[PDB]
Amino acid sequence: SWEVGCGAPVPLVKCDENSPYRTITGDCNNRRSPALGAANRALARWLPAEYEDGLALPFGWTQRKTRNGFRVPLAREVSNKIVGYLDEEGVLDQNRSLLFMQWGQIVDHDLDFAPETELGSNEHSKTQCEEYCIQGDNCFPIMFPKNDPKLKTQGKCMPFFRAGFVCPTPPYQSLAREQINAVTSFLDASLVYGSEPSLASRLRNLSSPLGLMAVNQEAWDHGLAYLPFNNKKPSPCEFINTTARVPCFLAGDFRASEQILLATAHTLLLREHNRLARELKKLNPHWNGEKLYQEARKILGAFIQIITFRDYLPIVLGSEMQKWIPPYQGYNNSVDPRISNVFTFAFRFGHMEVPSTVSRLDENYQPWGPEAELPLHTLFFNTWRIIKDGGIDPLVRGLLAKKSKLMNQDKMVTSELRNKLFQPTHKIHGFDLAAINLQRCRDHGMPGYNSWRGFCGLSQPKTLKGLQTVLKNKILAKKLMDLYKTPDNIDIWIGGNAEPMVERGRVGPLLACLLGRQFQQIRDGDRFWWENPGVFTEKQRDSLQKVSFSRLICDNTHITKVPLHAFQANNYPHDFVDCSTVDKLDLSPWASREN
Ligand code: HEM
Ligand SMILES: *[C@@H]1O[C@H](CO)[C@@H](O[C@@H]2O[C@H](CO)[C@@H](O)[C@H](O)[C@H]2NC(C)=O)[C@H](O)[C@H]1NC(C)=O
Ligand SMILES: *[C@@H]1O[C@H](CO)[C@@H](O)[C@H](O)[C@H]1NC(C)=O
Ligand SMILES: *[C@@H]1O[C@H](CO)[C@@H](O)[C@H](O)[C@H]1NC(C)=O
Ligand SMILES: *[C@@H]1O[C@H](CO)[C@@H](O)[C@H](O)[C@H]1NC(C)=O
Ligand SMILES: [Ca+2]
Ligand SMILES: [Cl-]
Ligand SMILES: [Zn+2]
């Protein structure tokens, strides 16, 4: 809306209705509506956008204009009064490994990306946003409230740029602004391969006819491969250590080097693809480069789907799993596969699962060297600790043997994320993920907490007493009322995350509904879902059902001891078995001749 920094619509393409392979963009999944689920379209709207002016201006843009007769509290102020805490002791999740957190980020990145408006480089805009805190067009700065310490050290605000949106089209009549999802809505390993054909090709190794992904040629992990470097300048990964000067990786997803464990995970996935391609070349010597790439790509996709629905979702959704994701009944071509705008806020529950440190463990799962445990903030956009400080194995061990943070109404987001986040475009470890999340809810025209409760068929609290009952927490409810005045005004991100978790789950009732629904649609609406008869042969599916993240690690690292259930809290050596005892992926059912 207004067209300043909008995204150009539908570079068209004709559909191969008989191909056994996903397109890269996600077009042609749905036959009747080939664009559903494709990258670079408007995120779906489950409820209509809510803007100050009804078109594109977010609530809190204009000081005089209230929401339902009340000013919205500052994002940073909600963060300070509600989201922060001091004491890291006792915060960890005793029945979830750190791989629980990290898998969620991986899934999230497969499904959605709403990139900030390209103001351009060379920006006086960035300057005006950051230095002068001048709100206008794409600049929607996060202003510091009264007595905020950042006043004394940072300035009047943190910069924030509005999300990219769909261009208005030749009718040109007035419509609410829709933000773009830049990645394919399908759970399709797009974070490995890309959602855009040009990037997808640049990632491939087209020098050999082997259907491999390109690997780093300047650095190796004791023989094993790294992602290639991103040669785009300037590099945030160089900026954090100018001595080291190690650039970011180049992956199927732009965000791959945001933090060291995410870059680690992207590494495992790349290695898995190359492994799969080599194994398939031995089984089918006649298969060409294309066929090899497509087939391993198709296996990796199913791997991510199986881990997510079998291992991850049950431990997020708990008792609500069955209620939103009943057993599969085949492809339903009437289901909307698109990711919804609100899902991209609901899935940010992950931010409350990130602990304040990261460890490198040695082969005995003991602290690796003198600085084994690092503050998380030092690991944003950090590639040098991988390339120059031991490769990925010591990080992978930490994933297995260390724990996720548990969400806690009094201990929501670690200060590493809340005070010291580094943004790739800027220069300081000074940003606030919580305040950004809340600013972003408004950027995207999110209906408020009570609207979503209603959508989910849940009671809608009107008074302090009502809120207390929902939150089962009198103090939090009061602090929310003091800031927001009405529950109707509470931003969906803090609203949904505030609720106590469902039985055996890690999210509250509002979020289990919003997530459950989306995941159901992600499965049921996908023509290439792995369990859709015809996608894979029955014998292939029998093989696939044996995959695990533990096997993934065994095959792609020099780690030889792993737990059988990677996602629960596991202690060495009690909970760890030799790799040789762990189920393998049998690729024999992929063997194909013509005789
Ligand atoms: C650094 C960041 C993380 C780890 C140290 C981290 C972790 C997660 C997890 C564990 C998630 C889900 C289980 C998850 C989801 C989403 N994130 Fe978040 N995250 C880190 C940093 C960021 C930053 C920076 C953003 C952008 C914020 C903005 O609005 O500008 C961010 C976003 C998201 C997101 C929305 C993605 C989209 O559609 O654009 C998630 C679903 N995370 N993170
Ligand atoms: C694309 O594939 C080729 C062939 O497999 C890769 O080549 C090999 O590179 C490794 C490491 O440099 C050597 O140890 C092998 O002996 C090489 N063999 C051949 C056949 O040349 C090549 O590096 C890949 N390209 C990229 C950019 O990843
Ligand atoms: C930067 O990297 C070097 C190795 O190149 C390391 O010894 C040094 O401590 C690093 N400095 C910072 C800023 O962390
Ligand atoms: C398929 O989807 C539509 C819309 O969700 C719905 O009306 C119908 O009940 C579904 N059909 C099946 C096969 O379950
Ligand atoms: C720990 O995790 C597993 C998940 O399969 C479960 O069987 C066990 O009861 C868990 N404890 C919880 C959820 O607190
Ligand atoms: Ca995808
Ligand atoms: Cl929505
Ligand atoms: Zn080694």
CSV table of C-alpha atoms in Angstrom, one decimal, residues 90-289:
chain,number,residue,atom,x,y,z
A,90,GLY,CA,16.8,-22.6,36.4
A,91,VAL,CA,15.4,-21.3,33.0
A,92,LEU,CA,16.4,-24.4,30.9
A,93,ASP,CA,13.9,-26.9,29.6
A,94,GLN,CA,14.6,-30.2,31.4
A,95,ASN,CA,12.9,-32.4,28.7
A,96,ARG,CA,14.0,-30.7,25.5
A,97,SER,CA,17.4,-30.6,23.9
A,98,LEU,CA,18.7,-27.5,22.1
A,99,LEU,CA,17.8,-29.3,18.9
A,100,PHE,CA,14.2,-28.7,19.8
A,101,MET,CA,14.7,-24.9,19.4
A,102,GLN,CA,16.9,-25.3,16.4
A,103,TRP,CA,14.6,-27.6,14.4
A,104,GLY,CA,11.8,-25.0,14.8
A,105,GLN,CA,13.9,-22.3,13.3
A,106,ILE,CA,14.7,-24.6,10.3
A,107,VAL,CA,11.0,-25.4,9.8
A,108,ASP,CA,10.0,-21.7,10.1
A,109,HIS,CA,12.6,-20.7,7.5
A,110,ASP,CA,11.3,-23.4,5.1
A,111,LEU,CA,7.8,-21.9,5.3
A,112,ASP,CA,8.0,-18.1,5.5
A,113,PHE,CA,10.0,-15.0,4.9
A,114,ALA,CA,8.7,-11.4,4.7
A,115,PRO,CA,11.8,-9.4,3.8
A,116,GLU,CA,12.1,-5.7,4.7
A,117,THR,CA,11.4,-3.2,1.9
A,118,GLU,CA,14.5,-2.6,-0.3
A,119,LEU,CA,15.0,1.1,0.5
A,120,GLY,CA,18.2,0.5,-1.5
A,121,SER,CA,21.8,0.7,-0.5
A,122,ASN,CA,23.7,4.1,-0.2
A,123,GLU,CA,20.9,5.1,2.0
A,124,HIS,CA,20.5,8.5,3.6
A,125,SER,CA,17.2,6.7,4.5
A,126,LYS,CA,19.0,4.3,6.8
A,127,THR,CA,20.8,7.3,8.3
A,128,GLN,CA,17.6,9.3,8.8
A,129,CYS,CA,16.0,6.2,10.3
A,130,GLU,CA,18.9,5.2,12.6
A,131,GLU,CA,20.5,8.6,13.5
A,132,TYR,CA,17.5,11.0,13.5
A,133,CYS,CA,14.7,8.5,14.3
A,134,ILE,CA,12.5,10.2,11.6
A,135,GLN,CA,9.3,8.1,11.0
A,136,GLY,CA,8.2,8.1,7.4
A,137,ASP,CA,7.5,5.8,4.4
A,138,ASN,CA,9.4,2.6,5.1
A,139,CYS,CA,11.0,3.9,8.3
A,140,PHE,CA,9.0,3.0,11.3
A,141,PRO,CA,11.5,3.5,14.2
A,142,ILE,CA,11.1,1.7,17.6
A,143,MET,CA,11.2,4.6,20.0
A,144,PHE,CA,12.8,4.2,23.5
A,145,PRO,CA,10.3,4.8,26.4
A,146,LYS,CA,11.1,6.9,29.5
A,147,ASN,CA,14.0,5.7,31.7
A,148,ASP,CA,15.1,3.1,29.1
A,149,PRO,CA,19.0,2.6,29.6
A,150,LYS,CA,19.4,2.5,25.8
A,151,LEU,CA,18.6,6.3,25.8
A,152,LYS,CA,21.9,6.8,27.6
A,153,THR,CA,24.0,4.7,25.2
A,154,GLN,CA,22.2,4.2,21.8
A,155,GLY,CA,20.0,7.2,21.0
A,156,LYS,CA,16.3,7.9,20.9
A,157,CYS,CA,15.2,4.7,19.0
A,158,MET,CA,16.2,1.6,17.1
A,159,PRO,CA,15.8,1.7,13.3
A,160,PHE,CA,13.1,-0.6,11.9
A,161,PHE,CA,12.0,-0.9,8.2
A,162,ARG,CA,8.5,-2.0,7.1
A,163,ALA,CA,8.0,-5.4,5.5
A,164,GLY,CA,7.7,-5.7,1.7
A,165,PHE,CA,4.3,-5.9,0.2
A,166,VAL,CA,2.4,-6.7,-3.0
A,167,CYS,CA,2.1,-3.9,-5.6
A,168,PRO,CA,-1.3,-2.4,-6.3
A,169,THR,CA,-2.6,-3.5,-9.7
A,170,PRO,CA,-4.4,-1.7,-12.7
A,171,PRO,CA,-7.9,-1.4,-11.0
A,172,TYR,CA,-5.8,0.7,-8.5
A,173,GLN,CA,-8.8,0.9,-6.1
A,174,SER,CA,-8.2,1.0,-2.3
A,175,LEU,CA,-7.3,-2.3,-0.7
A,176,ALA,CA,-5.5,-3.2,2.5
A,177,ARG,CA,-1.7,-3.8,2.2
A,178,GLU,CA,-0.6,-7.5,2.0
A,179,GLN,CA,3.0,-8.5,2.9
A,180,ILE,CA,4.9,-10.9,0.6
A,181,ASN,CA,6.0,-14.4,1.5
A,182,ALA,CA,9.4,-14.8,-0.3
A,183,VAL,CA,9.7,-18.6,0.1
A,184,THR,CA,7.6,-21.5,-0.9
A,185,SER,CA,4.7,-22.3,1.5
A,186,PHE,CA,5.3,-26.0,1.1
A,187,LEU,CA,7.5,-27.9,3.5
A,188,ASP,CA,9.9,-28.7,0.7
A,189,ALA,CA,13.5,-28.1,1.8
A,190,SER,CA,13.4,-24.7,0.0
A,191,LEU,CA,15.9,-23.4,2.6
A,192,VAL,CA,18.5,-25.7,1.1
A,193,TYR,CA,17.6,-25.3,-2.7
A,194,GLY,CA,16.1,-21.7,-3.0
A,195,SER,CA,12.6,-20.5,-3.9
A,196,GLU,CA,13.8,-18.6,-7.0
A,197,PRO,CA,15.3,-20.5,-10.1
A,198,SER,CA,18.3,-18.3,-10.6
A,199,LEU,CA,19.6,-18.7,-7.0
A,200,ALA,CA,18.6,-22.4,-7.2
A,201,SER,CA,21.0,-22.9,-10.2
A,202,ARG,CA,23.9,-20.9,-8.7
A,203,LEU,CA,23.7,-23.2,-5.7
A,204,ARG,CA,24.1,-26.3,-7.9
A,205,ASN,CA,27.3,-27.9,-9.0
A,206,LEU,CA,26.8,-27.9,-12.7
A,207,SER,CA,30.5,-28.5,-13.4
A,208,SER,CA,30.1,-32.3,-12.9
A,209,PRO,CA,27.1,-34.4,-14.1
A,210,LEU,CA,26.5,-35.7,-10.6
A,211,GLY,CA,23.6,-33.5,-9.4
A,212,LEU,CA,25.5,-32.2,-6.4
A,213,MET,CA,25.2,-28.9,-4.6
A,214,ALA,CA,28.2,-26.6,-4.7
A,215,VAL,CA,30.6,-26.8,-1.7
A,216,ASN,CA,33.2,-24.4,-0.3
A,217,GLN,CA,36.5,-24.6,-2.2
A,218,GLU,CA,38.7,-22.5,0.3
A,219,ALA,CA,37.8,-24.3,3.5
A,220,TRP,CA,37.1,-27.9,4.7
A,221,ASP,CA,35.8,-29.4,8.0
A,222,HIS,CA,38.4,-32.1,8.5
A,223,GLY,CA,37.6,-33.3,4.9
A,224,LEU,CA,33.8,-32.6,5.1
A,225,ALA,CA,32.1,-29.9,3.1
A,226,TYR,CA,31.0,-26.3,4.1
A,227,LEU,CA,28.5,-24.2,2.3
A,228,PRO,CA,30.1,-21.8,-0.3
A,229,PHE,CA,30.8,-18.2,0.8
A,230,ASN,CA,28.5,-15.3,-0.1
A,231,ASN,CA,30.6,-12.8,-2.0
A,232,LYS,CA,28.0,-10.1,-1.7
A,233,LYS,CA,29.4,-7.0,0.0
A,234,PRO,CA,29.2,-5.6,2.6
A,235,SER,CA,29.2,-8.7,4.8
A,236,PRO,CA,27.8,-8.7,8.3
A,237,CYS,CA,29.8,-11.8,9.0
A,238,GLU,CA,33.1,-10.0,8.2
A,239,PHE,CA,32.0,-7.0,10.2
A,240,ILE,CA,31.8,-8.9,13.5
A,241,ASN,CA,35.5,-9.8,13.3
A,242,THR,CA,37.5,-7.8,10.8
A,243,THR,CA,40.7,-9.7,11.8
A,244,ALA,CA,39.1,-13.1,10.9
A,245,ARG,CA,37.3,-11.7,7.7
A,246,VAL,CA,35.2,-14.9,7.2
A,247,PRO,CA,32.1,-14.1,5.1
A,248,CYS,CA,28.5,-15.4,5.4
A,249,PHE,CA,27.5,-18.7,3.8
A,250,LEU,CA,25.3,-18.8,0.7
A,251,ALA,CA,22.4,-21.1,1.1
A,252,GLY,CA,18.8,-21.6,-0.3
A,253,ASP,CA,17.8,-19.2,2.5
A,254,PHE,CA,19.1,-15.7,2.9
A,255,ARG,CA,19.0,-15.9,6.7
A,256,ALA,CA,21.3,-19.0,7.0
A,257,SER,CA,24.1,-17.2,8.9
A,258,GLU,CA,21.9,-15.3,11.4
A,259,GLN,CA,23.4,-17.5,14.1
A,260,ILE,CA,26.0,-20.2,14.4
A,261,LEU,CA,23.7,-23.1,15.1
A,262,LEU,CA,21.4,-22.3,12.2
A,263,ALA,CA,24.5,-22.2,9.9
A,264,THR,CA,25.4,-25.6,11.4
A,265,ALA,CA,22.0,-27.1,10.6
A,266,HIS,CA,22.2,-25.7,7.0
A,267,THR,CA,25.5,-27.5,6.8
A,268,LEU,CA,24.0,-30.9,7.8
A,269,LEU,CA,21.3,-30.5,5.1
A,270,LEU,CA,23.8,-29.7,2.3
A,271,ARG,CA,26.0,-32.7,3.2
A,272,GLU,CA,22.9,-35.0,3.3
A,273,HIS,CA,21.9,-33.9,-0.2
A,274,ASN,CA,25.4,-34.6,-1.6
A,275,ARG,CA,25.6,-37.9,0.2
A,276,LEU,CA,22.2,-38.9,-1.2
A,277,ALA,CA,23.3,-37.9,-4.7
A,278,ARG,CA,26.5,-40.0,-4.5
A,279,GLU,CA,24.6,-43.1,-3.2
A,280,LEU,CA,22.0,-42.8,-6.0
A,281,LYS,CA,24.7,-42.5,-8.6
A,282,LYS,CA,26.1,-45.8,-7.4
A,283,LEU,CA,22.7,-47.4,-7.6
A,284,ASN,CA,21.7,-46.0,-10.9
A,285,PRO,CA,24.9,-45.2,-12.9
A,286,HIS,CA,22.9,-44.2,-15.9
A,287,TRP,CA,20.9,-41.4,-14.2
A,288,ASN,CA,22.1,-38.0,-15.3
A,289,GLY,CA,22.9,-34.8,-13.3
